[PDB]
Design a protein around this nucleic acid. Sequence first.
RNA 1: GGGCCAGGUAGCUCAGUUGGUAGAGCACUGGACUGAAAAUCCAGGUGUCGGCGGUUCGAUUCCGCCCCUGGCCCACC
Length: 367
Amino acid sequence: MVGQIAKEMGLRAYIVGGVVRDILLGKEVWDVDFVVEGNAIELAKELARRHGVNVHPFPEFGTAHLKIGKLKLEFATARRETEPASLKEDLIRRDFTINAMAISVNLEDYGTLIDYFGGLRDLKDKVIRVLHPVSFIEDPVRILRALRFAGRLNFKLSRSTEKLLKQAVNLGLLKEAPRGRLINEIKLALREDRFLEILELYRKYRVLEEIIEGFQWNEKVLQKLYALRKVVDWHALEFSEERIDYGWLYLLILISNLDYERGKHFLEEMSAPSWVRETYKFMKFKLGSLKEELKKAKENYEVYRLLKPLHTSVLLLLMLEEELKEKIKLYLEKLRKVKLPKEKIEELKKGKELGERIEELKREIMN
RNA sequence: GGGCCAGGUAGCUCAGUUGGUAGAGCACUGGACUGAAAAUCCAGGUGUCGGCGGUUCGAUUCCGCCCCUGGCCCACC
């Protein structure tokens, strides 16, 4: 119906940006971004009115948002910067070639891919490529983004783009860039499943040294990241119903040898979840002594005591140790399995003494 | 429209962690009190401590998804 309304209003609308990429990559998304030649606000208003839904206008930006079913739609007026702007001008201001394309929703040309800069070829050749040499200068954040994309789609930076990125970082543009944008970009990064590769690209181009104060790369942390990769794989394999956010674990491993002050500062600026802060604060100090205790563990009940109160993340960090791996595993798929019938339980009840008794019975069962 | 921090406790205004049987100040019923009423006295409702599942013998607490309010945040690729 969008093409019909665009027909009536004498306008031209196009699906634009990452969405198009995801369409050509086959990935389905419920977030659609439109670029309109002419007024996008009226298009959004009318479209929202016909489907009988609410609309959220933004006149100052010249954009509007509306939600139809599971679809989240954003209509944006074509602009030449971050006189009427042509679609080409709206596309030329973007980051990468694969992100610079468009698909016409206009009825006559409907189903046509609009690609000026050859983003189709770069999507075909698995190449992350900037539109112009000044790209990373304009928005330093794109640097991270580039790597991020190169992480997810398994693409490669062109030699041009690589030199330009390295030049951008070497000019220290990463520090001058807004902190919030960078932090949020990293937040987007750690939510990727291929985020480890993104960390390899962060290592290669050394962006984390610029963003994070005091951060350095050694081999131990890297191998720890790979061990964490295997652990995450197995855990998300068998125990997958218990899944939590894995990227934050990698983030903890990165900041592991870092100072606690800059660490708390970083988790502060990153707005990390509560359990992440708990896990980190527990890791910086109590982790060592806990490991020592798990090493001294003989009976299974002591293991239960030293494990059960802990979160899943802590246990995942305990799987780093080879000696504790089979022990933590045995704790997961075995050490907790139990129940009790009616009559017996009723006899266990014949305050806190009930709980103590129950624990005595469980420790009577284990060993 | 996406993150998080909080805040979510009575009718309003607010505290509460090693999981273990819940509180304040003013309105609410009932009776003693009155010609009626109020003050005040005795007491006692002050409540599925957001909604729904899960773990647990047991969840206001541990975790997961959602409901609401407020603020910080990005708000493009």
